[PDB]
Symmetry: D2
Subunit: 281 residues, 4 copies
């Protein structure tokens, strides 16, 4: 009737040919986006190293590994890094970096694996747990909520948290959506991590379902061609009650705003909200 016949199943690959969509105009521009932003801010390195060291943390778990940029740093600082991610296409880059530098004893002890928050417990042979777990770069917002009850989110944090050893730390952040939703416009290049050395026109698209923010989409453009990403607009208010219950209350919360601590009714409006937690009980 009106069905469509595909040469190969979706998700399937074959020796000799590029995988599906591997080199469209959108993936190509996107490649440059994850490359022309694989640089870090001294302010960032300072803060991150600061927090981690002054906690006795050494065995760190990055659950938003990505191209490994944040882990490659902790690896150069002698930390015991375990980089993990659900995206094999993002991971390709972390691994490629580790192999190029396999001669450096540090990069030889760098564990890079594939894991999914939704099943992190079984995907990652932890056991002893880690001193610190990091999920920075606004990566958690990448996880949508197609279920409709944030349940998907609770499982993700419940799992991410049950990966930290008692008395352990958890640095999980997310952009400031309370502000983006309000202003409808999300500043382009207004980061605090990567030094934007690329041209980027960002078109913010918020979708409100029954008056409730449901999603934020960004269309990055450069010259003629563009690509897009979507995030779940998390409210600093709602994220907090959410990240804490993932621990079961047994946590010593604290929230920064672009590395500086945060006080409600504050004067400076943060670009990113970083939530740090010590797994008390």
């Amino acid at each position: 009737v009106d069905s469509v016949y595909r040469t190969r199943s979706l998700g399937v690959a074959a020796e000799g040919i590029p995988d599906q969509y591997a080199d469209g105009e959108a993936a190509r521009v996107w490649q440059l986006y994850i490359g022309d932003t694989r640089s870090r801010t001294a302010e960032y390195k300072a803060w991150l190293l600061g927090l981690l060291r002054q906690h006795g943390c050494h065995r760190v778990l990055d659950v938003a590994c990505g191209t490994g940029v944040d882990s490659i740093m902790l690896v150069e600082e002698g930390f015991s890094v375990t980089s993990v991610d659900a995206s094999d296409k993002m991971l390709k880059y972390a691994l490629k970096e580790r192999w190029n530098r396999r001669k450096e004893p540090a990069f030889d002890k760098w564990v890079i694996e594939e894991a999914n928050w939704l099943t992190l417990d079984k995907d990652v042979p932890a056991g002893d747990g880690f001193d610190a777990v990091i999920c920075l770069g606004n990566s958690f917002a990448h996880l949508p909520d197609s279920k409709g009850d944030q349940s998907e989110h609770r499982l993700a944090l419940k799992n991410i948290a049950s990966m930290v050893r008692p008395g352990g730390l958890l640095v999980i952040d997310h952009r400031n959506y309370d502000y983006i939703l309000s202003t409808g416009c999300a500043p382009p290049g207004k980061n605090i991590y990567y030094k934007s050395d690329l041209t980027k026109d960002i078109t913010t698209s918020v979708l409100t379902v029954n008056n409730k923010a449901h999603m934020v989409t960004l269309d990055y453009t450069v010259q003629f061609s563009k690509f897009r990403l979507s995030y779940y607009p998390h409210c600093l208010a709602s994220f907090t009650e959410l990240v804490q219950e993932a621990f079961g209350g047994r946590c010593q919360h604290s929230v920064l705003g672009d590395f500086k601590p945060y006080r409600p009714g504050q004067a400076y409006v943060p670009c990113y909200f970083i939530h740090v937690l010590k797994k008390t009980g």
Copy 2:
């Protein structure tokens, strides 16, 4: 405005979430299949190693690397191996193996890179040449004829031949499509490169455009362990005919080479009784 709107563009990934279609049912079963092909027959190893010694081939370029099964073997047998593929999804498994065995010196000198046949001259640094170039497992057939004049085929073969240094060897194969086209069905699961431990049922679809074969599509129905469970996936191939391919691979060297064809590791005499499942063309480059 009738046009679907994307959460994220096609071919873009994001930390925290699985890539585009990696967790689908077809991808899942397809993964059980490429992990089953990971096991070659004793006859095959003997033939390939036999063939590569008989010419002193030391440096080998595997241009259809895949999960690295054949490459992993030549690496263990002392060869200088550089593997290459256009598919990151499959190359991922090769890299993973080379990493686990990074402590074995032979594996630390095993080069694995991404490269596409159509742009092989630029994707891989040679200039000199390779003792032997292999493209086995019926991989070349994955390349379709989009334009209709097999120009991509000639360009891919040309770039592939280019990698063979003078006096070099090129071993490339394809399934017997002369037989598949004639009977419309693909031989009774009997494979000679690998032992298929997994159970499968194969539906063959041939498409003919203006009476000229243009494509063969195989739908594999696998009995997944669990669920006696039945799920499936599909793959397509350009049905290369022995005559057509012999003509094409020679033309890639400029007709400047010695060319002989095997029928399942044994020499093939036109008209022979035994109908081969695969045809292996072995070409020695004049100079």
Copy 3:
């Protein structure tokens, strides 16, 4: 990685249902345009009132649809010319006219296919109609993929250049000023019909309302539609320039005159205009 179709998009063939003609979504949608083909006496009264007290007789419906609004004006001896861009909507108007072809009135009912964007060439007028109606919030159905409302200006410029001088134009649109604000579009407001679970989805691009989508439900199946959220403020300056200023613009709100800073918040804003010059 191409996909292959047995037949092109838009093509039909003798013997088989057209593409998507009977999915679970179209089926529910059929009931939606059927379980709402009824009218409100308040509506009939207001519409007949306005039209008659203007000497209007030759009326042009540019949002014909299933013909429900025209079938009314036809039963009231008006000279009706029902037009629409949707052949699938029209199928219903025509089907009604043929069933009632014996009634001299329904035999003089002209039902054609026309597109606002090309109304000038699609509809042979020359003279101009006494009245033109585009009710039911139909104009909001036209999106703005162009990005500069230009598509909208052409639609009105054409819809207007279809009215004879001294002629009337009744074009309405739901109250989006309110929907955007409350995020929830009033579900089931008896002002046009008397028929569902509506899920409003607003999309703001760079802080600018860009679209409103409604997901209608029935129990285990649903369908959806999208509209351009027009602001009573922006629509006005828009509908007037389509005439070139030469018009006595007036705005109602649920069949009654509207006054800014009013107390009652309208469900629909009806814009009436007399083509002065």
Copy 4:
């Protein structure tokens, strides 16, 4: 999640905007094509009218109505005609014609309704039967074999035969797919039902599933007056033997069945290879 957000559900329309894909390039060229087929040959009219008189057939049911070309003819020639199709997009043109000529009494008594072969027993009120039932223009081939066992084909034929009253006539055809399958190409544009005033190039694609023909796809490249654009359609390639067997079985083997090869009787093995095969079946009772 990698799902896509629709502006409107598939198959839903909205006043003011063109339906789903009505204004595309393929639809546009496809429209030039169905408006070109609107013109039958003198040989065809003579044969069909000949055939329908030779049996006294008065009430005729056209089960593959389309734009109503054949129906419009039988209406002019005095028959009692009820046309029917599953495609509203095509039925639109038939209705439009009947409306323009509503003043001609023959056209006011011309019934046109939507009905699907698979549900013909319920879609059309008969119970009694029709003198003759026609399904020409190689329309039955539009019905694909989704399930793989031709069950839909048997169900559609059965419902179609049902409409033929005892002593009735059923005229149904299909192109010569025995020839198309063998040579992989569709005959040199020579058509016998209609005069093709429009220029066309046809690429034929045959798909064989397990060595059994399953589909024929035609890509028509039309030389549009002005400015070369194209559209595609697919068909189930019915073989004469298979179809003869199927149409008889639809009557329960209770009927007389003869096949024509382009309006002329077909003797197996004849020299002239027909473009179309017309099966004419008289229903025993």
